[PDB]
Design an enzyme around this catalytic site. Structure first.
Site, PDB file in Angstrom:
ATOM      1  N   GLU A 186      20.799  25.925   8.337  1.00 57.52           N
ATOM      2  CA  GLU A 186      20.233  25.364   9.536  1.00 57.52           C
ATOM      3  C   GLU A 186      18.921  24.638   9.184  1.00 57.52           C
ATOM      4  OE1 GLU A 186      17.908  27.895  11.971  1.00 57.52           O
ATOM      5  OE2 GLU A 186      18.798  27.177  13.816  1.00 57.52           O
ATOM      6  N   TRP A 220      25.028  27.725  16.519  1.00 56.73           N
ATOM      7  CA  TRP A 220      24.772  26.822  17.633  1.00 56.73           C
ATOM      8  C   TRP A 220      25.958  26.441  18.484  1.00 56.73           C
ATOM      9  CZ3 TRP A 220      20.356  26.332  19.736  1.00 56.73           C
ATOM     10  CH2 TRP A 220      19.239  26.474  18.923  1.00 56.73           C
ATOM     11  N   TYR A 230      15.623  19.712  17.476  1.00 56.57           N
ATOM     12  CA  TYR A 230      14.806  19.772  16.257  1.00 56.57           C
ATOM     13  C   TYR A 230      14.944  18.672  15.229  1.00 56.57           C
ATOM     14  CZ  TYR A 230      14.107  24.522  17.918  1.00 56.57           C
ATOM     15  OH  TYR A 230      13.756  25.591  18.718  1.00 56.57           O
ATOM     16  N   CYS A 266      12.969  26.751  21.469  1.00 55.86           N
ATOM     17  CA  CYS A 266      12.258  28.014  21.566  1.00 55.86           C
ATOM     18  C   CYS A 266      11.110  27.994  20.573  1.00 55.86           C
ATOM     19  CB  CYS A 266      13.169  29.202  21.243  1.00 55.86           C
ATOM     20  SG  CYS A 266      14.351  29.689  22.525  1.00 55.86           S
ATOM     21  N   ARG A 314       7.876  29.683  22.403  1.00 55.38           N
ATOM     22  CA  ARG A 314       7.656  29.858  23.841  1.00 55.38           C
ATOM     23  C   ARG A 314       8.455  31.011  24.425  1.00 55.38           C
ATOM     24  NH1 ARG A 314      12.268  28.834  26.687  1.00 55.38           N
ATOM     25  NH2 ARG A 314      13.612  27.362  25.548  1.00 55.38           N
ATOM     26  N   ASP A 346      13.685  36.307  21.965  1.00 52.36           N
ATOM     27  CA  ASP A 346      14.599  37.423  22.046  1.00 52.36           C
ATOM     28  C   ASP A 346      14.239  38.166  20.773  1.00 52.36           C
ATOM     29  OD1 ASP A 346      16.988  39.160  21.672  1.00 52.36           O
ATOM     30  OD2 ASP A 346      18.332  37.533  22.004  1.00 52.36           O
TER      31      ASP A 346
HETATM   32  C1  LIG Z   1      16.862  31.676  15.595  1.00 54.23           C
HETATM   33  C2  LIG Z   1      17.859  31.043  15.809  1.00 54.23           C
HETATM   34  C3  LIG Z   1      19.019  30.196  16.082  1.00 54.23           C
HETATM   35  N1  LIG Z   1      19.919  30.830  17.057  1.00 54.23           N
HETATM   36  C4  LIG Z   1      20.017  30.121  18.357  1.00 54.23           C
HETATM   37  C5  LIG Z   1      19.834  30.883  19.618  1.00 54.23           C
HETATM   38  C6  LIG Z   1      20.241  30.241  20.799  1.00 54.23           C
HETATM   39  C7  LIG Z   1      20.292  30.932  22.021  1.00 54.23           C
HETATM   40  C8  LIG Z   1      19.924  32.287  22.063  1.00 54.23           C
HETATM   41  N2  LIG Z   1      20.023  32.999  23.210  1.00 54.23           N
HETATM   42  C9  LIG Z   1      19.668  34.310  23.248  1.00 54.23           C
HETATM   43  N3  LIG Z   1      19.799  35.034  24.361  1.00 54.23           N
HETATM   44  N4  LIG Z   1      19.176  34.902  22.152  1.00 54.23           N
HETATM   45  C10 LIG Z   1      19.040  34.249  20.975  1.00 54.23           C
HETATM   46  O1  LIG Z   1      18.462  34.873  19.881  1.00 54.23           O
HETATM   47  C11 LIG Z   1      19.468  32.921  20.880  1.00 54.23           C
HETATM   48  C12 LIG Z   1      19.436  32.230  19.663  1.00 54.23           C
HETATM   49  C13 LIG Z   1      20.645  31.917  16.718  1.00 54.23           C
HETATM   50  C14 LIG Z   1      21.974  32.038  17.140  1.00 54.23           C
HETATM   51  C15 LIG Z   1      22.685  33.209  16.868  1.00 54.23           C
HETATM   52  C16 LIG Z   1      22.077  34.265  16.180  1.00 54.23           C
HETATM   53  C17 LIG Z   1      22.809  35.500  16.026  1.00 54.23           C
HETATM   54  O2  LIG Z   1      23.721  35.795  16.804  1.00 54.23           O
HETATM   55  N5  LIG Z   1      22.535  36.299  14.985  1.00 54.23           N
HETATM   56  C18 LIG Z   1      23.599  37.018  14.248  1.00 54.23           C
HETATM   57  C19 LIG Z   1      23.942  36.215  12.961  1.00 54.23           C
HETATM   58  C20 LIG Z   1      25.182  36.694  12.198  1.00 54.23           C
HETATM   59  C21 LIG Z   1      25.631  35.775  11.061  1.00 54.23           C
HETATM   60  O3  LIG Z   1      26.433  34.872  11.308  1.00 54.23           O
HETATM   61  O4  LIG Z   1      25.185  35.952   9.921  1.00 54.23           O
HETATM   62  C22 LIG Z   1      23.087  38.417  13.929  1.00 54.23           C
HETATM   63  O5  LIG Z   1      23.535  39.353  14.583  1.00 54.23           O
HETATM   64  O6  LIG Z   1      22.196  38.562  13.094  1.00 54.23           O
HETATM   65  C23 LIG Z   1      20.764  34.129  15.716  1.00 54.23           C
HETATM   66  C24 LIG Z   1      20.050  32.959  15.987  1.00 54.23           C
HETATM   67  C1  LIG Z   2      15.730  30.637  21.767  1.00 52.50           C
HETATM   68  C2  LIG Z   2      16.012  30.132  20.307  1.00 52.50           C
HETATM   69  C3  LIG Z   2      15.542  31.015  19.150  1.00 52.50           C
HETATM   70  O1  LIG Z   2      15.464  30.582  18.001  1.00 52.50           O
HETATM   71  N1  LIG Z   2      15.137  32.296  19.420  1.00 52.50           N
HETATM   72  C4  LIG Z   2      15.138  32.881  20.658  1.00 52.50           C
HETATM   73  O2  LIG Z   2      14.742  34.041  20.753  1.00 52.50           O
HETATM   74  N2  LIG Z   2      15.595  32.131  21.746  1.00 52.50           N
HETATM   75  C5  LIG Z   2      16.017  32.859  22.957  1.00 52.50           C
HETATM   76  C6  LIG Z   2      14.943  32.858  24.040  1.00 52.50           C
HETATM   77  C7  LIG Z   2      15.706  33.257  25.294  1.00 52.50           C
HETATM   78  O3  LIG Z   2      16.096  34.641  25.204  1.00 52.50           O
HETATM   79  C8  LIG Z   2      16.928  32.324  25.105  1.00 52.50           C
HETATM   80  C9  LIG Z   2      16.667  30.844  25.488  1.00 52.50           C
HETATM   81  O4  LIG Z   2      16.625  30.643  26.938  1.00 52.50           O
HETATM   82  P1  LIG Z   2      15.294  30.373  27.777  1.00 52.50           P
HETATM   83  O5  LIG Z   2      15.038  28.919  27.833  1.00 52.50           O
HETATM   84  O6  LIG Z   2      14.133  31.090  27.196  1.00 52.50           O
HETATM   85  O7  LIG Z   2      15.487  30.844  29.171  1.00 52.50           O
HETATM   86  O8  LIG Z   2      17.197  32.350  23.657  1.00 52.50           O
END
Ligand SMILES: C#CCN(Cc1ccc2[nH]c(N)nc(=O)c2c1)c1ccc(C(=O)N[C@@H](CCC(=O)O)C(=O)O)cc1
Ligand SMILES: *c1cc(=O)[nH]c(=O)n1[C@H]1C[C@H](O)[C@@H](COP(=O)(O)O)O1
Ligand SMILES: C#CCN(Cc1ccc2[nH]c(N)nc(=O)c2c1)c1ccc(C(=O)N[C@@H](CCC(=O)O)C(=O)O)cc1
Ligand SMILES: *c1cc(=O)[nH]c(=O)n1[C@H]1C[C@H](O)[C@@H](COP(=O)(O)O)O1
Lengths: 264, 264
Positions: free
Chosen positions: B58, B80, B94, B146, B166, B169
């Site tokens: 990424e 994503w 980004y 974020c 901003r 999670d």
């Molecule tokens: C930061 C960032 C980008 N992101 C984007 C992203 C977009 C929307 C979100 N929405 C919410 N509610 N929480 C998030 O952390 C979140 C993250 C991520 C997407 C998925 C994972 C995730 O599910 N983690 C798994 C990975 C497993 C693997 O494939 O190796 C895990 O359980 O660790 C982490 C980051």
């Molecule tokens: C956004 C992306 C990332 O890398 N890490 C995160 O923790 N998030 C989370 C924040 C929130 O839980 C959700 C995005 O929605 P919102 O705009 O904050 O409402 O993913």
């Protein structure tokens, strides 16, 4: 204020000597954060006398969308004279980005009205942000924004705000930024029928100029006084409608002012 | 890691129940900062296993200026996928902002080339910033950034970096973020012949989702293990020329992974 005096001591206890743009020389740390609970009192420094008059007018000017020092001048505020050109303009700084950030497609976004709509209709949003850091216009700006970005948050009927200051002149600049954004949280909250919460300040390069060390130590030898109280005498129809005359500070007994040169 | 687990506890003790966008429910606090000394080890979580192949692919996708998930797919990365359209585009997130910020008049600013040159030509600068928070294009992005903003800083020939998130999670996104930005500071330091300093993480709305409570409690009983070491095996001609092959993580001995649902 205790929080402020502790940061000055931190810069002095664990800072590095850095040189800078203005040629002056700084003691510096990177990364700091501090919280002020607004319900304890209005966070205006009491260990040296501050001039609240200029803080208030600069903020009302900002909210107008204005970037030309004429307004400030007819109100006897000269704090931005050094950066203004021949026509009084400072370029697209704060007031222009807050009220009319330019898009690639021709629109302009009023970040202050969108934020106000969000606090009323969607106060749990995680996107109630205002940014002055417009990369594509920085070159037109007289000075790059030091208060680059800020974020509001609501919990238990309280409005909080976090500022990110990229560069910070602790002695001169920080008393101004703390009072200005605390004053903005009070106005916002009144308009959204919220109570005030915390002003949180986060700093990037947080530094003390070499030519402010004696002043810094004189200030550090003082005990903080009890904080003043802010009374707003009127609730305008919009946030753009406040007047200087609506704000009253009471219970402010500060220590004498300490003068020190600005670096341009 | 000690400070990550201490923030998980802080969220569980002081968090306010907030109803968020997806209707799951969060427990949250506002305003938090953590420093990570990169000389002490790579800040990859050891109380549960994270996978670096997503973190690394990424980031390399970002520095490529790409906003379409095909590359990620070709490298087996799915993170994503939920936010991408039928054609795989996420819109101007980004990658577009970092390499081609759209100015009002149709030009583009390459923020990472700017940052590179600033670190090699003016390292004492207090303006070394990259921003993903492009207000004029937010409506076009599949999800607002974020990781909104970050600032680099150099002192005693060491490269530090602070990220402003901003919304956070704590369970899924925060381990990803810390490792992603610690990786970029190592790559930048290698290309600018600098040593590594601190990664500072400042967050806005920091939260724990209600459907992650069991998983958090499991993680809070595991004792943190010694951090790993990052070895970059090739010094490429530029920051845009790194390949996944070039990075190895020694000493990583985590506790087993904890699975937990994402909220869309
Ligand atoms: C930061 C960032 C980008 N992101 C984007 C992203 C977009 C929307 C979100 N929405 C919410 N509610 N929480 C998030 O952390 C979140 C993250 C991520 C997407 C998925 C994972 C995730 O599910 N983690 C798994 C990975 C497993 C693997 O494939 O190796 C895990 O359980 O660790 C982490 C980051
Ligand atoms: C956004 C992306 C990332 O890398 N890490 C995160 O923790 N998030 C989370 C924040 C929130 O839980 C959700 C995005 O929605 P919102 O705009 O904050 O409402 O993913
Ligand atoms: C922040 C901000 C706005 N600004 C803008 C601004 C712009 C560039 C800067 N540059 C440097 N090096 N330090 C600063 O604090 C600074 C501040 C200010 C400008 C002047 C004063 C100042 O001279 N301080 C006097 C004010 C007297 C008065 O208000 O009448 C003092 O008594 O401390 C404060 C803030
Ligand atoms: C910028 C403006 C403000 O409101 N407050 C501040 O603290 N400053 C200071 C920061 C630095 O000392 C100088 C700006 O120059 P630079 O871009 O940081 O080099 O004024």
């Amino acid at each position: 204020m205790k929080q402020y005096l502790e940061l000055m001591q931190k810069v002095l206890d664990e800072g590095t000597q850095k040189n800078d743009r203005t040629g002056t020389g700084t003691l510096s740390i990177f990364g700091h954060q501090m919280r002020f609970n607004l319900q304890d009192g209005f966070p205006l420094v009491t260990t040296k006398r501050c001039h609240l008059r200029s803080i208030i007018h600069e903020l009302l000017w900002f909210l107008q969308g204005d970037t030309n020092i004429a307004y400030l001048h007819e109100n006897n505020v000269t704090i931005w004279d050094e950066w203004a050109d021949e026509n009084g303009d400072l370029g697209p700084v704060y007031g222009k980005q807050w009220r009319a950030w330019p898009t690639p497609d021709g629109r302009h976004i009023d970040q202050i009205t969108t934020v106000l709509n969000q606090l009323k209709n969607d106060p749990d949003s995680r996107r109630i942000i205002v940014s002055a850091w417009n990369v594509g216009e920085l070159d037109k700006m007289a000075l790059a924004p030091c208060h680059a970005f800020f974020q509001f948050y609501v919990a238990d009927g309280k409005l909080s705000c976090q500022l990110y200051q990229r560069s910070c002149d602790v002695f001169l600049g920080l008393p101004f930024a703390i009072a200005s954004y605390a004053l903005l949280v009070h106005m916002m909250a009144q308009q959204c029928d919220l109570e005030v919460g915390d002003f949180v300040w986060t700093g990037g390069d947080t530094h003390l100029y070499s030519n402010h060390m004696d002043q810094t130590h004189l200030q550090l030898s003082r005990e903080p006084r009890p904080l003043p109280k802010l009374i707003i005498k009127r609730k305008p129809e919009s946030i753009f409608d406040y007047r200087f005359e609506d704000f009253e500070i009471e219970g402010y007994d500060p220590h004498p002012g300490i003068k020190a040169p600005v670096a341009i």
